[PDB]
């Protein structure tokens, strides 16, 4: 009935046991909607499976069911040509809009006007979308064969087809025929515009600054920056623009890119596929005569075993510092929570990046193990050592352990984040902007006046509902000496539109006479300080979404890329070559006590993969495959676990009851009886919340059944 | 003794087990002590040891009063908890899998604290679960503090003391893993187990 | 003002989220009630068996006891139940919420 | 001014959303806790069922 | 004993029916308030009305959850108590059987 | 990494059944004429991954206005003739050697026969004898391939897939290695 009364009922449950940026804002949004549609076309291609095999084959022309087999093929593969039509139409329009946007922004006005930073990142994501889509089209093969079968079936039935239909079908075949069609079309339509290299250089420079300054929070963004830099360099080379001349002009620095490529060589485009960042350089037109400049091509630091000491130390110190933080407090406490949450997310992203990059590198570099084996077998199973597998599961367990802790504190985190952002923004606008406003008022700076007033009017909150009339800054005269103002305090974050607008205006004041030439030292120092500190505000407001995205490891199971390369002789790889089973099997077979308790954290990866597929891929056969794999995987895990538990306890009892004098005498003679190493089955036995595929499994019951059968067998054998 | 008596006088042992297990909780302490004494004579694992209570009840001096004795007992746990981290600097506190404990016999402090606390707070009528909860909270806070820094000499065997806290919770029946998780993540214990096993 | 309209839309979304939370609680309570109801039936059946056994065991006459020959092993040796649960992750045993997440997503032998 | 009204309205939304999240978090925790209690209850029930069956077989005549 | 069957088939089914009715009410009220805000000449009154409705819904939902949780906990506790009483009876029967067997052996 | 292959030849010589069998592992007898088609494969040759785009060209006289545009920006050329059709064999000398060379003079050419399984069949050769035609033999292809300067001469049979893996394997070996 009232907010307070509703909150009291909820509490009872807890105890139970300017129009210039408006125009740019609209353009930025239009590009964003297109990128989402592009990812949907990219997902559609990745989840493509050969549907032509199930179509019956015809061996003679007199078959009574020839006509009907053709009807069938057509119905079945009709919904698949329609989406191909849409995809070709979408990419054609997307390229046209991108080229037109560059045409608008490459005019001579560029020499005076500056361009926003989020916009450049959006453009980088745009070209990355083109690159991934081109790779999907190039590598996929079942699409072309399926279309060819449909075309032949339609011709045989002559489904009353017309002039335009055949023209479109021929065009689509050629479109899928051409190698790197998307890249070639984009380059051809972009080379006509003069100065496009300068804009590409700005995007590359922005990516370098972000990467160097750790201006990211998720591994996806980290990999995107490298991919954008590589693709931008490839586009720069051509008949009009040369990278080497630009580098000699100081416009672009290639040493930083070379070092980054050397440190990190493989990044994931989409799914199990990987891209070598050095491939773009290799494909550069002018690379042949100047290959000495780049040293990243030649191939040492991916051994995760030697990188675990720092991970363990960082994990312990963060947990120890955080465990003590498990009715209003000072702003310092909220700021500490803000910092702690950021540190935790950064650490999780670093761990996730390490695991994924190692996996990608191993896949790209297969070994050279029996004589006969599939590419997946060589790429994953035989490229991993016992120490490597233990380290990977250790990192996975740490990631999940920290993830669950942060989720529990989500409520406290959210309150602290909202309180801090509101206080920092209001204090900055209401205090830090007074001095620049006074200087602008004293000496006519109308350009500065508009931006400052817009910033101080879009987001500022006034306790009395109106701006004070006694402010010396507004009148332009120097303030006395204080005119202190008490800003309101509350827990709510700025809206996305407000945050974007204020940031754009704030960063427009600082740019490369210029508008920054009329500002003193301290005024700017605060301006850039706020600019570099407010980037994570939007990320931290949606804490739950950021945390799950940062701790995503659903790409360790999908293998559709390798299935296509098996020439369609395989429906799905056997459980032996999947990563989660290999890690679990290795732990069980080795029976290592140290890693015994980490098995569960290596078995719930299926839940993450299933959630990712259902939420993003919107496909069902992947979910069915996961369930089938888990069905037998769990049974094998239970069977092995019960057998080793019974054997370990039986030997322990026998050794414990054995005489000690005989053992000592045997040891002296030289026939000592080795003791049984201890293990840590204590945690596994007590587990009763094994959550898998949205199901609750009682591991204790299954172990009890196996042990009871074993005990009965032993007693019968004894008699 | 329990194992020997199981196959010697099963009828008496079975009657004792039923008598002890199904004893109502609302009964007075005198009858419960009588049952425990008989149960102890049979070798059963009673939570409260009547012999310890009897031995600890024969003490008196000039300045002894019920209120100050209760305060002393409450303060004893605080002193033990605050002194627990000091064991991290001991060389002989190296946990080893072959022993499932420590070379300096610090793994028996868990049952010592539980038995001492139960006997002291059943003599003085004070609650046990609340007192043990406070001891665990203080220990967890201090154990987190010592693990925050990185001094080599002072934190040579920080993992060993972490396992002691796990042993205290496991052995203690009045303490549940839920309380430890709230005040101490199980992740640290898991890492400690891996490090020692190596 | 567009701000007022945006707020009202947010309130409507909040109501939708509250309704979703209500469903997320109804299914859990229903599942637990159905499961616990089964346990009630099992307990009641066991209670009847124990009552019958107690009546039967309090009637034994010691003089009625008889022993068979030492060389007779024809008696059917008693065997305990040994049912081990398997195929746990099966399509049929899927939680209703998973079913909605399933059907919402996307979905020739005679002529072969 | 409209800005102040928007801030107040958004504060109303923020507290309501936090209340919704708290209810969901409790609901998940309650489901886990009840299931664990349910599982241990089943463990004892099946053990009792086995024991009574053994007793009946031991005492049954014929 | 009677209180058990009472809450089995009178409490939980009623709560589920109330939850379903609440869901329909939540959907209907949201549509009505949104349609009222657009149509109504005055917007502040509409904003207040929807604020009252959502608060009423939140309080009702929390109340329904609390009573259901309390009922489930109560039902579980009585089931556990019944099981413990059952275990004692079984143990007594087992003890009676074993003494009966020793007397026959003697 | 990516190799572009275009197959040319006379009509009804077995280029669709050849490509279809290689990619889908299936064969058929129906003859659906082909204005244009496209097929793809991903096979490893000499221990490296190679992407094999395949381009199918109509050989029928009328559809000569879509054939030239598939020639440029290619790597290898495939010429297919039916072992049981002397007319196609002579067409290679009269044409498909100038046509490819004129558009692409410095590209390697692969010459391979087709319908190997039918060469030993008595019924088909007999009917060809009523036409006063005799099937082609192995040495004849060697001379023709040497005359046109092709890398190799091979033979294939889609129905039996006896030499259909080799032809594509050697075509990649012809461009990637030299
Ligand atoms: N016995 C046998 N028949 C074949 C073989 N390959 C193709 N055929 C038959 O030859 C017919 C026509 O040959 P295609 O493979 O369609 O010829 P094409 O290269 O596509 O030439 P176009 O006539 O221009 O379409 C098919 O319908 C089959 O019946 C083969 O290896 N063996
Ligand atoms: Mg054809």
Residue numbers in the entry:
A (entry chain A): 5 to 21, 56 to 337, 341 to 367, 380 to 421, 428 to 540, 542 to 572, 578 to 784
B (entry chain B): 924 to 1121
C (entry chain C): 24 to 130, 137 to 141
D (entry chain D): 10 to 71
E (entry chain E): 1 to 106
F (entry chain G): 2 to 179
Extract from the study:
The Rho-family GTPase Rac1 activates the WAVE regulatory complex (WRC) to drive Arp2/3 complex-mediated actin polymerization in many essential processes. The WASP-family member WAVE exists exclusively in a 400-kDa, hetero-pentameric assembly named the WAVE Regulatory Complex (WRC). Rac1 binds to WRC at two distinct sites—the A and D sites.
When the A site is occupied by Rac1, we noticed that the A site, the meander region, and the WCA helices have undergone significant local conformational changes. By contrast, in WRCAD-Rac1, the density for the W and C helices and part of the meander region were not observed in the reconstructed map, suggesting that upon Rac1 binding to the A site, these sequences were destabilized and released from the WRC. Distinct from the D site, which is flat, relatively small, and largely hydrophobic, the A site is concave, nearly two times larger (~1138 Å2) than the D site, and mostly positively charged. Given the low affinity, it is surprising that A site Rac1 binding is mediated by numerous, mostly polar interactions, including 17 hydrogen bonds, 3 salt bridges, and several hydrophobic interactions (p for more details). Sra1R190, which is strictly conserved in almost all organisms, is anchored within an acidic pocket on the Rac1 surface formed partially by the Switch I loop. To accommodate Rac1 binding, the A site must undergo a major conformational change, which involves flattening the concave binding surface by ~8°. Another major conformational change occurring simultaneously when Rac1 binds to the A site is the release of the C-terminal half of the meander sequence in WAVE1 (after Q130, except part of the α4 which is accounted for by a poorly defined density in WRCAD-Rac1), together with the W and C helices (dark magenta vs. light pink). The release of W and C helices explains why WRCAD-Rac1 is basally activated.
